[PDB]
C-alpha cells in the first residue's frame, strides 16, 4: 500500500502519493539498507529541492542500519555540494553508514528523537583471488578506513585517533550519548 491524497482542481481532480506530498514540505526519507539505487533517489530528491529553492532547509529523516559505503558517499558529497542546509533527523536507528550521514548534516541541525539508537564501527570488506590482488584491495580498504575516520573526526570535533579506537568494534550510543559524542547537536521530544 502507498496511500494517495486527492487535490480538487478546476478540471476535476489530481493525485499525490504521501511521499510526493511530504517532498513539497522539503522532507526526504532514507529508509533501510544503503545501496546505489535508493541512494541515487535520495541524491536526486536533494538536487530537485535545490532547483526548487536553493535557500530553504532540507529535512533528511534517517532510519537505516547502513549498507554500501560508496552509495552512502554519493549522498554525503551531494549534501555538502548543494547550497541548502540538510538537517538530519534520526528515526528508530542510524548505524554504520546511517550514523555517518546523520553526523554529516549542517552544524546545529543534526537531530536524534529520544529513543532513536546510533551505532558506529570501522568498514567491512572481502576479496578473493591472487595474493597480489588481495594486497591491492587490502591497501584500498585501509585508505577508505582512514578517510572515513578523518570525516567522522571533522563532523564530531573529536580527534581522529579517538574515532579510530572507538570504531575498532561496534559502539552503540543512546540519543543523549550521540549529543555528548558530537554525532548530533540536539534531541527533539515535542514540537
Ligand X SMILES: *C(=O)[C@@H](C(C)C)[C@@H](O)C(=O)N[C@H](C(=O)N[C@H](C(=O)O)[C@@H](C)CC)C(C)C
Binding segment for a second copy among 10-18, 154-162, 178-186 (CB under 8 A)?
10-18
Distance (Å, rounded) from C-alpha 119 to C-alpha 139? 25
Binding mask 2-41 for ligand X (x = CB under 6 A): ----------------------------------------
CB of 159 to a second copy, least distance (A): 19
Distance of alpha carbon 66 from alpha carbon 145, whole angstroms: 15
Q: Please, which residue, 24 or 108, has the CB nearer to a second copy?
A: 24
Phi, psi at 49, each rounded to 5°:
-65, -30
Q: Tell me if 67 contacts ligand X by CB under 6 A.
A: yes
Secondary structure (3-state) at 55: coil
Task: Assess 157 for contact with a second copy (CB under 8 A).
Answer: no
| Beta strand 27-31 pairing with 171-173 | unpaired
186 binding partner (options ligand X, a second copy, none; Cβ < 5 to 8 Å by kind): none
116, 175 in Cβ contact below 8 A? yes
Indicate which of ligand X, a second copy, none lies near residue 39 (CB less than 5 to 8 Å, by partner kind). a second copy
Count of beta carbons in the 10 Å neighbourhood of residue 94: 31
Least distance in Å: CB of 87 to a second copy?
14
Between residue 68 and residue 87, which ones bind ligand X under the rule CB under 6 A?
A: 68-70
Q: How far is the CB of 8 from ligand X (least distance, A)?
A: 41
Residue-wise burial string across 50-68, b where 16 or more C-beta atoms lie within 10 A, e elsewhere: beeeeeeebbbbbbbbbbe
Catalytic residue among 74, 121, 137, 174: 121
Q: Which residues are catalytic?
A: 96, 121
Amino acid at each position: 500500500l502507498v496511500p494517495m491524497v486527492v487535490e480538487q482542481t478546476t478540471r476535476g481532480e489530481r493525485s499525490y502519493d504521501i511521499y510526493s506530498r511530504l517532498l513539497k514540505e522539503r522532507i526526504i526519507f532514507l529508509t533501510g539498507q544503503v545501496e546505489d539505487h535508493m541512494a541515487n533517489l535520495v541524491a536526486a530528491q536533494m538536487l530537485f529541492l535545490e532547483a526548487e529553492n536553493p535557500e530553504k532547509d532540507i529535512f533528511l529523516y534517517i532510519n537505516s542500519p547502513g549498507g554500501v559505503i560508496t552509495a552512502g558517499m554519493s549522498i554525503y558529497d551531494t549534501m555538502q555540494f548543494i547550497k541548502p542546509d540538510v538537517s538530519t533527523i534520526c528515526m528508530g536507528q542510524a548505524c554504520s553508514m546511517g550514523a555517518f550521514l546523520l553526523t554529516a548534516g549542517a552544524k546545529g541541525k543534526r537531530i536524534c528523537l529520544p529513543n532513536s539508537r546510533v551505532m558506529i564501527h570501522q568498514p567491512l570488506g572481502g576479496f578473493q583471488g591472487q595474493a597480489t590482488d588481495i594486497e591491492i584491495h587490502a591497501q584500498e580498504i585501509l585508505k577508505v578506513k582512514s578517510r572515513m575516520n578523518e570525516l567522522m573526526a571533522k563532523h564530531t570535533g573529536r580527534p581522529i585517533e579517538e574515532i579510530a579506537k572507538d570504531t575498532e568494534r561496534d559502539r552503540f550510543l543512546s540519543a543523549d550519548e550521540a549529543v555528548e559524542y558530537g554525532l548530533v547537536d540536539k534531541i527533539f521530544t515535542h514540537r
